[PDB]
Symmetry: C2
């Protein structure tokens, strides 16, 4: 099925070493891979009711409007993990539209 | 939907820089990401009717039985691309079972 196909991508991205996740138009998490749970130290079920603003310490510092217009962009910020670790990361964002949903794919390297 | 979720993984893995793909129990491609199409130089529709043995020049050299038993394994082989490029790569395999399907997730770095 179309579902069969996508399920393969599910298994692949969750075995990928790099933290990868999708944010909705209000920066709510929509999908997170295992590496993202490990890095942020939140469970998947916790992350899927959370916002980037709950992790990205410097969220209000970013010129988000300009970010969106860029449509592909890489930059550094600090994340705070569930156990209170503060660490620098490098996020790469790609914005996409599927039907009536705009969202971003995000890849995050722990710097 | 469950499909909604998996579709996010589809978008993520296809934006990942690293070549990633899934093989079925007979090493037939089941799913390939864009980076895999780029590396092998075959279109997605071509790859999805192909076998690892059509790309992996040294396929018959691997002790596949022992590979499977390992269940997680990384090693070098040579790939031949559609335009006839021969190049060394490093494949990382993880074997998984979903329902009645055993398959592997493969990540490939061009060495």
């Amino acid at each position: 099925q179309s579902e069969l196909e996508f399920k393969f991508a599910h298994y692949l991205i969750n075995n990928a070493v790099e933290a990868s996740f999708c944010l909705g138009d209000n920066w709510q998490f929509l999908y997170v891979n295992d590496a993202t749970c490990r890095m942020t130290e939140y469970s998947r079920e916790q992350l899927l009711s959370m916002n980037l603003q709950d992790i990205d310490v410097d969220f209000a510092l970013h010129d988000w409007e300009e970010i969106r217009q860029k449509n592909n962009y890489t930059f550094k910020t600090r994340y705070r993990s569930q156990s209170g670790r503060i660490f620098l990361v490098e996020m790469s964002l790609t914005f996409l539209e599927d039907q009536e949903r705009r969202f971003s794919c995000v890849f995050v390297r722990e710097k």
